[PDB]
């Protein structure tokens, strides 16, 4: 009966939602309350009982804001399909758009490969028992997450004082240096779970360190890393207002108009017909291009 009285206190609020005129908010809160109460009260949905808190938190954190953005894409906020027809007929940047997307996907693929490789190699090396300074080594190795990724670029620019190929190489190397410790922590955790008896057998088979790695360590780590690799690929594919100091100005690799900002990955290529609503608070168009990028990266992912 205790879980029933909690719903009423929540249920008292659902009146205030309809009182304030926010029908979508009322619908969401009533739906979530009813789902939680029924799932908890009924003994048959044990798995749903375990799932409900995380799913509800995920919903209220990402799904509702995302669908609100897609809805904003269908209104002026300054519409239905006029913004999408515009972004389809966006010929002025269409040819640069394809090439910028191609370079972005190539860059994301190479950087996720390099980051995973470096992280896994370092985690395997630190896993070694013969290594003496394991703790100091791995703490100094994770240290590159100390910077909040906002002035690491500034210090890089200070230490480096053109050549758009060099710009691309610096782009890739700074991503590797900034992102490897994530995969290294992940590979440390996933290397804790490998049984040692397989290593014993492989040693019985004459395997050296490199062969042992490539045959047992890698295939047993690449399997649980695949969803993580896909998500990290998406993160290295798209970015936002953060870690933005590389390439101060426009490198113009493929006719791209890039700011004093990093991660030109289909965001700084479009900032001005985008960003703070197309530069002139055209958040409808901004949400439209965001929906387009979401749709095509989702098509790529599957």
């Amino acid at each position: 009966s205790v879980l029933g009285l909690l719903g009423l206190l929540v249920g008292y609020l659902v009146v205030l939602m309809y009182a304030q005129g926010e029908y979508l908010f009322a619908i969401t809160t009533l739906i979530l309350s009813s789902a939680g109460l029924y799932i908890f009260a009924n003994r048959k949905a044990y798995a749903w009982r375990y799932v409900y808190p995380g799913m509800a938190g995920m919903g209220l954190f990402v799904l509702f804001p995302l669908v609100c953005t897609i809805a904003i894409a269908f209104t002026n906020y300054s519409t239905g399909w006029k913004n999408f027809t515009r972004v389809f007929t966006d010929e002025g940047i269409q040819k640069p758009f394809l090439a910028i997307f191609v370079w972005t996907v190539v860059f994301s693929l190479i950087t996720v490969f390099l980051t995973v490789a470096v992280g896994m190699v370092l985690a395997c090396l630190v896993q070694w028992e013969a290594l003496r300074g394991k703790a100091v080594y791995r703490v100094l190795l994770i240290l590159p997450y100390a910077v909040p990724s906002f002035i690491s670029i500034l210090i890089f620019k200070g230490l480096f004082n053109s050549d758009p190929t060099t710009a691309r190489t610096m782009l890739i190397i700074v991503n590797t240096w900034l992102g490897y410790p994530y995969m290294m922590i992940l590979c440390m955790g996933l290397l804790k779970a490998i049984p040692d008896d397989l290593y014993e057998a492989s040693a019985m088979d004459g395997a050296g360190p490199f062969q042992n790695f490539f045959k047992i360590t890698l295939p047993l780590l690449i399997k649980p890393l695949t969803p993580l690799m896909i998500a990290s690929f998406a993160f290295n594919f798209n970015n936002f207002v953060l870690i933005q100091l590389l390439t101060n100005g426009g490198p113009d690799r493929l006719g791209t108009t890039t700011p004093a900002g990093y991660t030109d990955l289909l965001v700084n290529y479009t900032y001005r017909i985008a960003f703070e609503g197309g530069g002139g608070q055209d958040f409808g168009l901004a949400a439209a291009i965001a929906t387009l990028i979401f749709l095509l990266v989702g098509a790529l992912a599957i």
């Binding site: 008896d197 397989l198 014993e200 057998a201 492989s202 040693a203 019985m204 088979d205 004459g206 395997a207 050296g208 062969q211 045959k215 047992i216 295939p219 047993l220 399997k223």
Partner: protein, 371 residues
Amino acid sequence: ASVQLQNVTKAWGEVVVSKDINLDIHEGEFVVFVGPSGCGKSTLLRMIAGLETITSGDLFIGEKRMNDTPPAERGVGMVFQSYALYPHLSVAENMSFGLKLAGAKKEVINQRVNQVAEVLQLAHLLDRKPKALSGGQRQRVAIGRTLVAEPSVFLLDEPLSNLDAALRVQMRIEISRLHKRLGRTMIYVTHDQVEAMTLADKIVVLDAGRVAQVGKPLELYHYPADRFVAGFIGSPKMNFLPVKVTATAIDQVQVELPMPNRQQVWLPVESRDVQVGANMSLGIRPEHLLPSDIADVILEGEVQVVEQLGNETQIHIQIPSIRQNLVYRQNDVVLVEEGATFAIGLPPERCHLFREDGTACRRLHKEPGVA
């Protein structure tokens, strides 16, 4: 490879699981290790292979010190008790892993793998992950992996534990054929008396981390040198009787049975060190006990348990003034019910005489099949 061990002592902190093992296996010799559960067989196999450190002593393989040689360059192959199977590889990949690593050829490896799978009756399961298998199939996959590899030393470790009788017989035949083909030194750890007595040129019987005896299977069965070994060799443990020595001859010791009539018999055993009045320990195997139709002491008792095996009947008799029960193995099916009287004869020439400390008075009877 003439695997040799000298003073090999292992220690897991304070406990000692291997104490002064002095073994000597000649090149191309079949040696089987049998011992009570937890004696040190797997630890000794690992120490030979190198999966665990040797605390003190010298391990010789091919007249080269291998105390600090790494397990990969030891040149040996081992069949793990947990089968050490790779979960992320099919059966074919698991069995061909070794040849692929050691300079693959893409055709000889395939031919060897197919032949080994065919002779292990593992053809239809050539592309299934070890999750989609049974225990017997996993053990056979480990055997096939070792056989596909061509190690100098075969360190088999209980490879027939999860197999039916016919499959065990076929596997033993195949292993014998492989040994007679390669001529490679192999060490085999098993708990099957049939396997030990069949596949052996020399058996080592461990006991609490030490060697109790070494010799031919017939020598171990017929002339055991220790009470523990005598109780170990044979599937029904040999009946042991406490007994007092009354007199000693030049080459035979006479003893007095604890039954009320206290009859005394002459045993053709070595007389040295035998002291008049010592509390001996007589031992007679169940198979050797003749029916009562022979003029002898005749240990009449009362039946307690009758176990029917189809081809033989095992009768347990609770002799008066005897703590344990004499085990009797009669041929074929015998219809004897519990609570009935039964009598058995004691062959004087089939009795081993064991001293108080556990040693055995050497038998002086020339048993068949033993030089």
